[PDB]
Design a protein around this ligand. Structure first.
Ligand SMILES: CCCCCNC(=O)C[C@H](CC(=O)NO)c1ccc(Cl)cc1Cl
Ligand SMILES: [Zn+2]
Length: 417
């Protein structure tokens, strides 16, 4: 089966269900934006993100390694191609067993109902919803797990972000929260095939293009961590001392990025600090089990208390004794924690897609390219750029920007800067 069962066009009429104008709660200011529900719990907003951070409302460039284009994603044809590009990447990810596992975990990873001030009841947290304009002009609040949205002013700053909370560190206390991924299918980075070149800031022009399915999978791995409330505080950083150029500029890379890349990178998180993180999150899951056991009713008519207790029993793989009380089993916790942090990694997706990719997160990006993955003559669910039964099938020739030059327009060189 396919992950996105409908092929949306941007101009398809709104229906108030899976094609709708929506607002993001606590932005209020905003005019409704057209949004598309491409799968249970997952929406796409083909708009530049001027909404999730009120200090980031201006796409115009100031007078770094950055890329600005205030006009990108401003027209209907662009939003149509954005929507279709994003859906194609979800299908490419879902066509692998690994991406099928990751996307199943993401859909199951409903943000915890921890918005009550009274431990006698469960209550949704408002900011894990969107407000959907119905056909009768009224708003209905819909819980969701993931929104794909266009980048803000700096086009290259893809990131998985989410609405904070006064008291609760939702992405690190086991609860989770709705994740907003700033992402574009319309650009990709160039990188170098020799490790000594790719990790040197002065060398290489970016001969090979990153497959954007890897880039989206990388962000979805962050989203999985954040939906299960086990992201590592970005303040916890590897003060990189394995690359003389990183050291010269004092570049610090968060453990959350090294975990997400996987492979050799994750080994830069020392065993003692990893063990500390694992214990910390185990304790958060126990807190959720204790909260569920104290819950004696629920706010809302969306679902029953027993129903939602069971949703979170399944999400966190809790055990239930003959009295109905929930508990955290260390064996099942370690299994889920390890799936989300060690099995879902960038390096492992590279193995499934059979693409060329950076060998480490600890490199230097060489260039940014404009691409168009929507035409099947350029890029397919099954092959990405390396189209079978063409000259592009072998040796990653489709990602080779010199051989496949009509599929890539270099917009900026970063090497030197
Ligand atoms: C527009 C062309 C494609 C852009 C790819 N952006 C990304 O991979 C986002 C990534 C941050 C991250 O890992 N978030 O999870 C990043 C951001 C800026 C720079 Cl300098 C280098 C990197 Cl690795
Ligand atoms: Zn990342």
């Amino acid at each position: 089966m396919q992950f996105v069962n409908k092929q949306f066009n941007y101009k398809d009429p709104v229906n108030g269900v899976d094609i709708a104008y929506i607002k993001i709660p606590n932005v209020g200011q905003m005019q409704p934006v057209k949004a598309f529900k491409i799968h249970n719990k997952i929406w796409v907003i083909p708009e530049r993100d001027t909404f999730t951070n009120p200090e980031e409302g201006d796409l115009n460039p100031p007078p770094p390694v950055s890329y600005y284009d205030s006009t990108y994603l401003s027209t209907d044809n662009e939003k149509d191609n954005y929507l279709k590009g994003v859906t194609k990447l979800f299908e490419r990810i879902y066509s692998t067993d690994l991406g099928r596992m990751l996307l199943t975990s993401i859909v199951r990873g409903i943000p915890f109902w921890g918005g009550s001030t009274i431990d006698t009841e469960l209550k949704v947290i408002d900011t894990n919803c969107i407000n959907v304009i119905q056909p009768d002009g009224s708003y209905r609040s819909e819980e969701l797990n993931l929104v794909i949205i266009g980048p803000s002013a700096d086009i290259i700053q893809f990131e998985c972000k989410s609405f904070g909370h006064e008291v609760l560190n939702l992405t690190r206390n086991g609860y989770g929260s709705t994740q907003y991924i700033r992402f574009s299918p319309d650009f990709t980075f160039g990188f170098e095939e020799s490790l000594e070149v790719d990790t040197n800031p002065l060398l290489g022009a970016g001969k090979f293009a990153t497959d954007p399915a890897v880039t989206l999978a990388h962000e979805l791995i962050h989203a999985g961590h954040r939906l299960y409330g086990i992201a590592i505080n970005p303040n916890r950083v590897f003060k990189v001392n394995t690359n003389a150029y990183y050291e010269m500029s004092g570049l610090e890379v968060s453990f959350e990025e090294l975990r997400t890349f996987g492979g050799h990178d994750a080994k830069f998180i020392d065993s003692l600090q990893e063990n500390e993180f694992r214990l910390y999150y185990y304790n958060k899951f126990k807190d959720i089990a204790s909260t569920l056991n104290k819950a004696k009713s629920i706010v809302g008519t969306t679902a029953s208390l027993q129903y939602m207790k069971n949703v979170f029993k399944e999400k966190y793989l809790l055990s239930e004794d003959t009295s109905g009380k929930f508990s955290v089993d260390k064996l099942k916790f370690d299994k889920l924690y390890k799936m989300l942090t060690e099995i879902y990694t960038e390096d492992n997706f590279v193995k499934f897609f059979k693409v060329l990719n950076r060998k480490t997160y600890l490199n230097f990006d060489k260039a940014v390219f404009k691409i168009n993955i929507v035409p099947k003559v350029n890029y397919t669910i099954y092959d990405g750029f390396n189209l079978r039964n063409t000259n592009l099938a072998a040796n990653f020739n489709g990602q080779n920007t010199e051989i496949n030059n009509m599929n890539f327009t270099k917009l900026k060189n970063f090497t030197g800067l």
